[PDB]
Amino acid sequence: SRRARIERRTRESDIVIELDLDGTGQVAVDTGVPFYDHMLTALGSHASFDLTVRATGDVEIEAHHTIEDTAIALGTALGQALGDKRGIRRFGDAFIPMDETLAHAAVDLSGRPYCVHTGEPDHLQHTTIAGSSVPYHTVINRHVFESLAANARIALHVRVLYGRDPHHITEAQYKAVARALRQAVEPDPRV
Amino acid sequence: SRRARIERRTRESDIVIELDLDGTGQVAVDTGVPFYDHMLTALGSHASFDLTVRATGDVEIEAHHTIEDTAIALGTALGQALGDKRGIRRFGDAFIPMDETLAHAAVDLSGRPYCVHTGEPDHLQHTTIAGSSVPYHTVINRHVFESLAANARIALHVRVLYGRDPHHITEAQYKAVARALRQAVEPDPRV
Amino acid sequence: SRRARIERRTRESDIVIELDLDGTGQVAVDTGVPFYDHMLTALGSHASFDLTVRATGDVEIEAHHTIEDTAIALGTALGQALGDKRGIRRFGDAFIPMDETLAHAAVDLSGRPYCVHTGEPDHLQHTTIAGSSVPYHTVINRHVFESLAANARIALHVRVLYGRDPHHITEAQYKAVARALRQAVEPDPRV
Amino acid sequence: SRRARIERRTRESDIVIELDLDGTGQVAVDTGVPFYDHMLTALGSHASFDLTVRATGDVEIEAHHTIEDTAIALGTALGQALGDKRGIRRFGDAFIPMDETLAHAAVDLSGRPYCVHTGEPDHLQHTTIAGSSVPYHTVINRHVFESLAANARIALHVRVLYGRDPHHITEAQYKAVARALRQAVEPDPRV
Amino acid sequence: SRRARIERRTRESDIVIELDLDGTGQVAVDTGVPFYDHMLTALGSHASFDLTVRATGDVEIEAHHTIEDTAIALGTALGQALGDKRGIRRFGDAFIPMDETLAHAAVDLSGRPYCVHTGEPDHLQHTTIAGSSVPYHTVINRHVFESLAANARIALHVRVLYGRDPHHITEAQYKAVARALRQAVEPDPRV
Amino acid sequence: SRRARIERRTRESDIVIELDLDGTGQVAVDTGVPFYDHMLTALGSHASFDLTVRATGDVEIEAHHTIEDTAIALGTALGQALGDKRGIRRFGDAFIPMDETLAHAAVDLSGRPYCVHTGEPDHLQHTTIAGSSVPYHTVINRHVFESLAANARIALHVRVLYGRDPHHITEAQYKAVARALRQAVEPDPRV
Numbered sequence A, B, C, D, E, F: 001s002r003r004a005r006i007e008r009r010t011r012e013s014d015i016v017i018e019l020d021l022d023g024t025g026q027v028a029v030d031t032g033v034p035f036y037d038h039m040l041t042a043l044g045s046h047a048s049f050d051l052t053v054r055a056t057g058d059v060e061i062e063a064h065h066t067i068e069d070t071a072i073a074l075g076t077a078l079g080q081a082l083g084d085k086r087g088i089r090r091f092g093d094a095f096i097p098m099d100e101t102l103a104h105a106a107v108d109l110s111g112r113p114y115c116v117h118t119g120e121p122d123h124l125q126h127t128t129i130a131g132s133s134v135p136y137h138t139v140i141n142r143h144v145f146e147s148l149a150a151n152a153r154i155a156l157h158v159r160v161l162y163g164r165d166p167h168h169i170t171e172a173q174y175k176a177v178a179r180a181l182r183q184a185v186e187p188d189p190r191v
């Protein structure tokens, strides 16, 4: 019904997305960038999408190409799955408290790509979230949101009202986008 | 059921409003001020009202009297259509992204007129939106919201979080008020 | 009794004023500048003058010449109608609230032309009030008051205490001048 | 002739107002908030109203609900007693010196509710006037003036030019409103 | 179904709370601190809880101990009534306009106690709301929200966007928390 | 009816005042300080008093003692002539434009001496108005107003809104006090 499968093969990466807007949060993400997997699993779950993401890319360089190519492909899938956008709420927004952090996202499924990202503390422009695998540079958060909005052809406004921990700040933003999309894609019982 | 017809005849203008709160966005606006027609059509549609507005006024002077008299009459209609306000959500709010602009409105159908308008950039106090007909001076936006709130006897808080284009800033505010009213006037399944 | 008819024919304009200081607000103004007509109708009415103004001028250029020539002729009429100024209150002042705006005017019918205009927000030096006809540039308000005072040979002090809307700010000033003149021209039962 | 009796029963308070605009200052106020009684007795007397106010409310909470409900009911009475407002002065203003304090009020009985309150020193936002009974928090002064203006449907501008004592500052404002109303409601021998 | 009865007996106070999350706003509060009773009645009603609160404490000292012990016990009741939190919306937020004041609350029923309180004007750190009984010091508002969040084990973010009257600022915050909880505790038809 | 004759003999001066509050501006002033004579003639005339002032003092020293003793005696006369103050307007105020200068005075005939003087430009604290006789130091203006208020037992607030010429600034203040007294001492047809 509201499903899309997108395959995107570049010099740098190979991506497969399966998206259902009308899911129950059945989510499986494997990009080779485990913090990014965690963020897209939060996005898929909190959006009540069913979402499969399989990505392999040039992580010897760093995560950037894989992260960007995945967000492009996911945006393309969102736009294709929304189709004509008849009968939906269209507007959605969500506040996400995560301990000390408060984030917000507002969306308009307008067919007019726009992204505005504000309030992220300056330390996230050079922060690395590093474990035993490929690390995640938080400067990429803005890039993920612009790539999603640009390829879904939606207006996406993401705000950090305040926060300190880069993991809390990043995860609250992904969750806020997720819950804002959930509200916007839902059938509107009056239109 | 939740309907009002208001006729308001002054030295300056003659207004007829037909409002149904429980509509599907059947909207027809003719004020002689075409940008204002566009804004009240957005307000009527995004509120899921059925709304007819016919206004003729002294536009040789400028739009102000017609715009104000229309907003007074529309506020009066909203207040009459709400009646005793039994069983409604009462509170409503909506964020409207419009490209670079983000606006917000929050309402309390409290029977206590109040309007607070903040964040509109200073250039909108002397901006004109001009086409082939009677122009619209954006300084009037505040006046429209105060006139609506004062005559509906509601609390209306309109915020521009940020924005640049005066058309985007104005339309996002009208749409935000519209979606905030829609949520507030809806039956509350628990009261 | 306290009446004057002034005819003023220049290269730019042709003006006829009929003024009675002891009127009941019977006012008819036609200058070809409809916002100016509105302001002089407010001035004539709020002053309890009987006032007829017929002006035709070079509005292809803009309203300035017609507005100035009218204010000169009206000032001349006021001064002629006051004559020897025996037995009048001489001093008058009035506060005019107009929604968010508060204006004040104080007059001394002293035979010593002086005008002081203060507190008008800076945006009124480049604001246009535009309808379907010849527009009104609010920068002219100061010019109207100086032309009135200079030709009536009176002291006129006009103050904007605060305000935002250029129509409210302009109309409150004309009304304040009107009510200040009304008080000053009235017979003083003790002199 | 220009009389109104208003009864207003809420969960929080029970109010009866009897107002005559054409009185001689026959005033009796009992709200359970003795400083408020003093202020409305000054307002009734200085306005040359005949005014009876009987209010009982939830003063166990604090004076706010009773003070607000009384000001709403009094505003409603003022608006009803003014009726069509034919033949009145319409505009009124008064300066009240009270020792070190100077206050001013200006009114327009315009049918367009507006209140602007300026110049009150910042200490009155957290001052308590306390005796042997229910105290009066001076932060409520603004609320009283907005409630009066909103329900009488008038423009009310209240200014503190300067002052120090919170009792002098509050009483000078009530007296200024009182004398401004007195002038505005009076028959205008020329309209 | 989602009910809790909490009894909390300390040296300073004796508290009984009966809470039903799935109520219709049947609320009865008696703490001996009547402004606090008013705030918890607003919280219970606006949350559509059924809520009984009976508290007696050492109000000879001041309200603080009773207010804190009540908020602890109420938080404990909320956490117990939520149980495993299966199938709920989890996130909730609400804007409350109250005349000049705008407040907001956002909650995450995360099992991770956190409270952030921002934007309350500095005068509320030393304001007293006083009637004929035990007064309420507004500095305690922060303490109530931290005690609720800490014992319910939830994330609670309370914001004052702007406001002046301490009663409006306090009541808008309690109402915002109330409506945010209502949304968060509701069954989520998709999880 | 409302008359007083005051004789005041000090080491420094000998003063006789004859004052009628209900005069037609029959004024004769001789103090030996001709600019002061001019100011009290303006005060007497503009107040519609009948006023005779004869003063001789130690002008070899300077005008100060004579000016002060005269203002004391005049204040005493005003207070005695007002008597019980039954049936008067009590409050009065007047704006006086004098070319570039605007002054204001507000009075309350309260029996509570108070004077507040503000806005006089700093150059008037060391300006001399000098002719062919005894000069007048404008620093004395404040002293005259305090001496009048203190001995009449009235509240007198004198303001210079703006001005440049010390003669215009001084004369506008005396005239403003004069017209404010005139309004305040007049019978109030409603009390």
Ligand SMILES: O=P(O)(O)OC[C@@H](O)[C@@H](O)c1cnc[nH]1
Residues within 6 Å of the ligand: A042, A167, A168, A171
């Ligand atoms: O709220 P969720 O259960 O979707 O997230 C789990 C949470 O424990 C984890 O993502 C986290 C907690 N702090 C940082 N990250």
Ligand SMILES: O=P(O)(O)OC[C@@H](O)[C@@H](O)c1cnc[nH]1
Residues within 6 Å of the ligand: B042, B167, B168, B171
């Ligand atoms: O979002 P709507 O379809 O209600 O609005 C139409 C839109 O294309 C137009 O109003 C607009 C776009 N930019 C400025 N104005």
Ligand SMILES: O=P(O)(O)OC[C@@H](O)[C@@H](O)c1cnc[nH]1
Residues within 6 Å of the ligand: B064, B065, B068, C042, C167, C168, C171
């Ligand atoms: O107060 P008056 O009735 O003279 O003015 C009419 C009024 O409705 C109109 O001039 C106006 C209202 N807001 C801007 N202009």
Ligand SMILES: O=P(O)(O)OC[C@@H](O)[C@@H](O)c1cnc[nH]1
Residues within 6 Å of the ligand: D042, D167, D168, D171
């Ligand atoms: O001016 P009135 O007589 O209406 O007010 C009496 C006055 O003595 C009292 O209200 C007061 C004096 N200082 C503070 N309050």
Ligand SMILES: O=P(O)(O)OC[C@@H](O)[C@@H](O)c1cnc[nH]1
Residues within 6 Å of the ligand: D064, D065, D068, E042, E167, E168, E171
């Ligand atoms: O909105 P509610 O009816 O729950 O609140 C009643 C309201 O009248 C009262 O709480 C109030 C109004 N201003 C301050 N307090």
Ligand SMILES: O=P(O)(O)OC[C@@H](O)[C@@H](O)c1cnc[nH]1
Residues within 6 Å of the ligand: F042, F167, F168, F171
């Ligand atoms: O306004 P009066 O006529 O009372 O004042 C006469 C005036 O010509 C004289 O006092 C003056 C003019 N400029 C300074 N002083």
Ligand SMILES: [Cl-]
Residues within 6 Å of the ligand: none
């Ligand atoms: Cl002033």
Ligand SMILES: [Cl-]
Residues within 6 Å of the ligand: none
């Ligand atoms: Cl926000």
Ligand SMILES: [Mn+2]
Residues within 6 Å of the ligand: A064, A068, A143
């Ligand atoms: Mn890139």
Ligand SMILES: [Mn+2]
Residues within 6 Å of the ligand: A038, A167, A171
């Ligand atoms: Mn995590």
Ligand SMILES: [Mn+2]
Residues within 6 Å of the ligand: B064, B068, B143, C099, C168
């Ligand atoms: Mn207007």
Ligand SMILES: [Mn+2]
Residues within 6 Å of the ligand: B038, B167, B171
């Ligand atoms: Mn548009």
Ligand SMILES: [Mn+2]
Residues within 6 Å of the ligand: C064, C068, C143
């Ligand atoms: Mn010119």
Ligand SMILES: [Mn+2]
Residues within 6 Å of the ligand: B065, C038, C167, C171
């Ligand atoms: Mn107008």
Ligand SMILES: [Mn+2]
Residues within 6 Å of the ligand: D064, D068, D143, E099, E168
């Ligand atoms: Mn209130």
Ligand SMILES: [Mn+2]
Residues within 6 Å of the ligand: D038, D167, D171
């Ligand atoms: Mn007092």
